[PDB]
Amino acid sequence: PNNENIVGYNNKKCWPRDARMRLMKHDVNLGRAVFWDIKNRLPRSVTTVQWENSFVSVYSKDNPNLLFNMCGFECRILPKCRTSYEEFTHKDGVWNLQNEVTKERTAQCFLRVDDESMQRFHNRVRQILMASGSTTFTKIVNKWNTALIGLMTYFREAVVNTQELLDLLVKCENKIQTRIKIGLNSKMPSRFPPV
Amino acid sequence: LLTDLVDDNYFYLFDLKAFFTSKALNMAIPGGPKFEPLVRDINLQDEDWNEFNDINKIIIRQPIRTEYKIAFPYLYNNLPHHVHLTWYHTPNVVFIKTEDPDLPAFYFDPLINPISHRHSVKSQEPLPDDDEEFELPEFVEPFLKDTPLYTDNTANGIALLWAPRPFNLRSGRTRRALDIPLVKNWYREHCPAG
Amino acid sequence: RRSRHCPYLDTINRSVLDFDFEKLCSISLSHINAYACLVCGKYFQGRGLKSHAYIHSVQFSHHVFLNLHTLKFYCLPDNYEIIDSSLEDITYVLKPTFTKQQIANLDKQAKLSRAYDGTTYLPGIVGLNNIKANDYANAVLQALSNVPPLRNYFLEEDNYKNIKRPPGDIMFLLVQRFGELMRKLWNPRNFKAHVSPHEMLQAVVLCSKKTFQITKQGDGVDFLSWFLNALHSALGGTKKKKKTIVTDVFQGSMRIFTKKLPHPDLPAEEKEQLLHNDEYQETMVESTFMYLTLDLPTAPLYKDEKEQLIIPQVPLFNILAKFNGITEKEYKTYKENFLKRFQLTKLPPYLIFCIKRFTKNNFFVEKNPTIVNFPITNVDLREYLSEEVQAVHKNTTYDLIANIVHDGKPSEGSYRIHVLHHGTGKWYELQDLQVTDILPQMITLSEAYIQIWKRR
Amino acid sequence: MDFLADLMDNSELIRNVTLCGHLHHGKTCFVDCLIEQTHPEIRKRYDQDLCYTDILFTEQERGVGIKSTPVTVVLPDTKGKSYLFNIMDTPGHVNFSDEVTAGLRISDGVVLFIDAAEGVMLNTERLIKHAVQERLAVTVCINKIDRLILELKLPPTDAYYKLRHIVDEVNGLISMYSTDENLILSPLLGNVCFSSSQYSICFTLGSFAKIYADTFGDINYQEFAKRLWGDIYFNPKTRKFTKKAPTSSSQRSFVEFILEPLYKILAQVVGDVDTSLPRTLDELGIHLTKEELKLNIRPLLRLVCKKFFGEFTGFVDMCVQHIPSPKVGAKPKIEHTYTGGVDSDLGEAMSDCDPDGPLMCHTTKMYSTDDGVQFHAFGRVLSGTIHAGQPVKVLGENYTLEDEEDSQICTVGRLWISVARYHIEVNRVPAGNWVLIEGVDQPIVKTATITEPRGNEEAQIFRPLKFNTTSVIKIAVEPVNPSELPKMLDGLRKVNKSYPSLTTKVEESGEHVILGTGELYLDCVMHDLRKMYSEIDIKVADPVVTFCETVVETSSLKCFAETPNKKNKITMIAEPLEKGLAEDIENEVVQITWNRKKLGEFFQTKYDWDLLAARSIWAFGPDATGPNILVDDTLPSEVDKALLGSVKDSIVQGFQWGTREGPLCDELIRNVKFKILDAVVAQEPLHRGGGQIIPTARRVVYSAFLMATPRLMEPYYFVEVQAPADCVSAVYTVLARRRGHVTQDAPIPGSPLYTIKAFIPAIDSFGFETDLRTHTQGQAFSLSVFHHWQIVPGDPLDKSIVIRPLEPQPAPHLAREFMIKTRRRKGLSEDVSISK
RNA sequence: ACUCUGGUUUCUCUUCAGAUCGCAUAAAUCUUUCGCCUUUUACUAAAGAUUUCCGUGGAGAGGAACAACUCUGAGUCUUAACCCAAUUUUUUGAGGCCUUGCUUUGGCAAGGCUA
């Protein structure tokens, strides 16, 4: 009666206000109804599904964007008919979803690196840097290279649109370079050649 | 070194209370200062789309500027915490300064708009019917008949009323030279154009 | 004038008639002359022309209405009163009326009350609704619900309506609304098997200084203490009413024997020298109590001798070793230690046990998981009473009637109560709206938090 | 205060006075002067202006009066006879005219405060019109006369000219609004005070002549006051006053005897305190201590004027000789406000104003406690005596002799006599007084009437306040936490109680709505609702005005509707009303209570309406004074009038409902004439019940309105701007961007400031004052009030119009966007099909 | 026009500080949020709580200088030429008699008579 279905509702804060799910009354009620229906058919003793750890996204007249997070990729699909004037292929991380039957493009998946994977990579870099008191420079740089390509070859198309990840990669790279520099000499160099 | 202002209407939305409200609202007056966001850094800044925030129900005529949100803070934004209500208005001080001291202190200078007496306009007001019964005693006169209407100190004294604090008071307590900011009233005003 | 000629009686649907909501107009937000539609179940403004109820009547073709104040039925499109014996059930649900004959025999009858929806229920066993996890309030109210004398005092609105109230007082909202909730709980002709105390919750929130809010759960013992004190204070009138219903039912008397202890580093000879001073000698303080606070022994810190952690077990008389002349309990304040002895002097007709399950350690708040083994049918407290007060108190046997049980971590606290239905040996566990028949043996296996006992 | 209590029992020594005027004209400062007169321990600070009535923290911080503050003091007159003054300090801001209206109801006379430097401002004219229409005595108090001396520096002749011009303009306004000849205001008649509340100056001609008499002696101050104004020159040779100037440079008696001494007093202090001030004070009989001559110029002026002018007696003379006592003014008060009128038995009993009799107290204001939990009703005791601990019957606003359901029995708690910051706790209050009543909060919303619980059944209620302005600004409110909705609803009902003009309603979409008069009004409402009362965080939507719907052409199709049983058919058409007819209906020029003959004569004479059509009028508007007309145009030869009249009430009610809630939006229907052409009525009375006719009447009203070319009407504000000569261009520039056109830009006589009058849409007026003050460096100040409804440009029903999400629409697209977004906010369908 | 009232300035000291101590405005420390981050010492900038410092007011106390000069307040704030009375007292026509009631008598009460 007090319209509190919007309080605990989770949506993707990674996207702008007009890009994430719009929390109307009808569609929030529909999403909570869907989650309740799915949770009903699962016995509590056998397993459970938590609303807080779940995300429910709708697409209606009042929601032009469909949101989901699959395998570390945060994707937002936007049909060409909704809010989409025309297609731009200049952006690298936008997938041109194409209707197979009509051989025509109908939607665009806007890819983005999930924040959980961001935090995982940042924690991996922190773990590498912490275990570097006795570690040689070659081993530190090898661990950096391994983690960095494991991240990049996975999110090859999704990093570019993810501006928060670009700033994180540079920060972590500079952090490990500073680690090597301070391993060399205590005082920081004014300029240190990249060679 | 002084300020030509006669009232504090010049500092509308540009005073201490207005700047306190700005800082507490994480908002920047165009000529005012800028501060880091208050303790409510992420209180409701990233509120998502809602049926109450629905832009489809909002009629746009003129954008709600920061000045609107500071002049009427409890109306034009949500969560107005640590917000000070600025002074609404003071009646326009209409003091007319005199350039030539030779002119009389009480004088109808051209700046004042003329008053239409409009005696020819139909207007009837009660009259004593020329009753000769009432005659003033020979020893009664208007008050202060001997004293003149104005002296050479009248215009200067009147001008001292509409003066900044050090010069509008005839006596005070001495202050150390450190405590006197001679330019504090310069940056408190709006920065000149160009 | 054309009563008994209304053709809209069949239009009334008793399923949606829920009077648990606040009596305010759906548009004008006015409590005055609130009219409840009997077709849609909503509240409206009034009977007159250009009123919200009148407009609603000619809009949705809802021709039957009920006056929530005067208990009268009206057909606003025609504006004539409806008087019939068929609709008398609705008025009873809205404003239950309990006579002395019904009140006296309310504890000696056993029949499944019939609800409109088709689900059977019982009066006094009705489970309350949860609003943002307020299970502590529901448990406390159900514990007070099972108390016969307080219920009978609150089942009659005239028992406290004609008392004097201070002009600025708001504590009386906790009395009349509590009586309304008691009447609703014991309603034998309720339309549903559950009662939702929205107005009662608003009264609790308003009377408190924003304490025990509906949104966030609170301590059961603290809420019960505040509720009992407010009921005693509100019913005290514009004076010091020493003997109220709450005082006569729950309040007892105990004697406190306090002996201050010197600093531990003080030598024995100097300790004996200070023993001559009255500061470190016994001091008698006789203070009445609203409830008895029983402190559990510290939970086991290791496993047993068989490498298997064991749930602590304590007899009821072991935690009842307090409140007697033999046991001396040390009170370690932040400054000095005291040896405060307790001596029972006046057993109340109904005794309330408040086990201190939650204590705050040096860093956080922990819950004691100790399980108390207590017989629920025969406990004698004559031994704990003094020889001077055992003669006047010829009755000491107590029977458990309610047991509030807290389960889970303090943050994710869950409150359940095992009530005893008077007139039958059955015990009912009340978890939120769910009523479950629980065998008498299973109650003692739960973490008892608040208990109420009857002398009989 | 025992003498104060004993003065209450004498209705002849009681004055119920309302202080009214434009914003910042010295009303509050005047009440502060009166309190300083009566309370020796309460003294204004040297620099900070004491604001004794401004008890609200919002009033103190904003520096603007917001709510009325009652003050009950014992003020002696010129002859030393003490009276009992009930003084209402009404706010001067145009957005808070509701408090002024509430004060005027429980008052018998009006003291109008006008700034001397300023002319007759917008709120001055509005309150003059309101007080005249409320049938109250009008007295002018031209305040801030020090401005003409220390600020404008005008010669005394020009100061007299400015004061005379102000008096002439006020007299012209009163003559235009009223008809009574004896309403002429002039200081000779004693209706006008000249005062300076900053420097504690207050005098009439009588009081200043009394000063002469006390100083010189052997002078009839009453007869001397009749010469101290107008073109009555004084001849020193003959010691007599002549209408002809004896000399070329002879001054008026007012100038020579009043304005010259005032100028000399205010000029020997501001400029010559150091030398020749003690000589002047000795010449005036004023003695000041050594430590009092060391004060600054402004406190010195205040002290010197307090010594020279003493107590405030000219104001008391004005309010005693011209403002009638409760006993004298009871009869017009009952004739105007009471529903039953003076003809009823109680109406006759009210005119006696007997302290012992039928208790009938009318309350128009409600003041909240410190915690905000409890409200105290405030109003006038018009008959009988109320007592503490006494049960009362508290009639509502919908209470009538038939229903008797809006009333409720309550026990009166403690009673108080309210004087701003402190209240005198009393045990009883006789008739003709103002009393604070507790224990009566719950049944009272807006105005109310309090009577004895038993023994009085003839007792009707008093007519509710007819506010001078309509609350058109609407804002939606929602809590930040949806779980705290009950707290917000309690706060909404509290602010509804505490604001006479506030209107809190819930739309069909569950959106809570607050109706206000302006930006400052709703800002204060929201500040109260957040800080006090609800004590919770609340979200505010962007302000949006409320629209009205009309028709610009007659319907091209004879719309028809049928009852569900299909036994009744109504044919109706809708056409626009004649110009000025809706305004006349709203202004209560013509009433539904008029007999058909006079109504037909008025419509035929002043509107050229045919006698057959003029006498067939059935109902007016959504309400009794609504701006819509229902005309029964059915030919008697075709439909039986007696058969048709059997369902007249039901079709009238359906018409009122349909005009209340329009087809296009849930908005009022304005300026539409409805003609009943064909009305087939069933004969059996079971099939022609209200529940069948009323929905059918509403549907046929909707169909007739929709077929006729519909338009949206928006509220337009009237704006008065005080700006200098160089700031007029900036005002023009600001008004251009907001669809505002200027109707008048005239210089203020006696001041270098100009006055620009313009009409601005109320939806483009948001932030208009802020923009005007920012663009003019604060030199242009404006007040906006609702004036009239105007048709929104464009076609509301044009489905080809495309509305952009966050872009202002052009002029042709305004109506369509307004209707669509209003429907979206209300929660209705996307668009209205003409079929429905 | 009467009599008593009895300072101002300055240097110290001791305490109390609401109040814009201050119509001016510093620094340090601690605890939270950040910003830089690689460790001290510096910091970034907001909030909260402290301390110090540059100053300030009132009162109290003790010296010095002009100690001799007067204030203010109180006290009753104290005087004659020529001119005057229909609303309260030195110019004011206000007198007497009788009746009857009544008081223990004296007297009182009312009315009448005038000139």
Author numbering:
A (entry chain A): 1120 to 1314
B (entry chain A): 245 to 438
C (entry chain U): 100 to 555
D (entry chain C): 116 to 951
Sentences from the paper on this structure:
Here cryo-electron microscopy analyses of human CE pre-B complex and B-like complexes reveal extensive structural similarities with their CI counterparts. The results indicate that the CE and CI spliceosome assembly pathways converge already at the pre-B stage. Add-back experiments using purified CE pre-B complexes, coupled with cryo-electron microscopy, elucidate the order of the extensive remodelling events that accompany the formation of B complexes and B-like complexes. The molecular triggers and roles of B-specific proteins in these rearrangements are also identified.
We affinity-purified CE B-like complexes (generated ) and subsequently determined their cryo-EM structure. We subsequently determined the structure of the B-like protomers at 3.1 Å resolution in their tri-snRNP core. Nucleotides downstream of U+2 base pair with nucleotides at/or near the U6 ACAGA box, forming a U6/5′ss helix, similar to the situation in CI B complexes. Notably, a second copy of the 5′ss oligo (denoted oligo 2) also binds, which extends the U6/5′ss helix through additional non-canonical base pairs and base-stacking interactions. This structure therefore mimics the extended U6/5′ss found in CI B complexes. The zinc finger (ZnF) regions of the B-specific proteins FBP21 and SNU23 bind side by side to the backbone of 5′ss oligo 1 and 5′ss oligo 2, respectively, stabilizing their base-pairing interactions with the U6 snRNA in the B-like complex, analogous to their spatial organization and function in the human CI B complex. For example, in the B-like complex, PRP8 adopts a half-closed conformation and the BRR2 helicase domain is translocated to PRP8En. Moreover, essentially all of the remodelling events that have been described for the U4/U6 proteins during the formation of the CI B complex also occur in the B-like complex. These include, among others, the repositioning of the PRP6 HAT domain (PRP6HAT) and PRP31, and the disruption of U4/U6 stem III and the U4 snRNA quasi-pseudoknot. Taken together, our data reveal that the tri-snRNP has nearly the same structure in human B-like and B complexes.
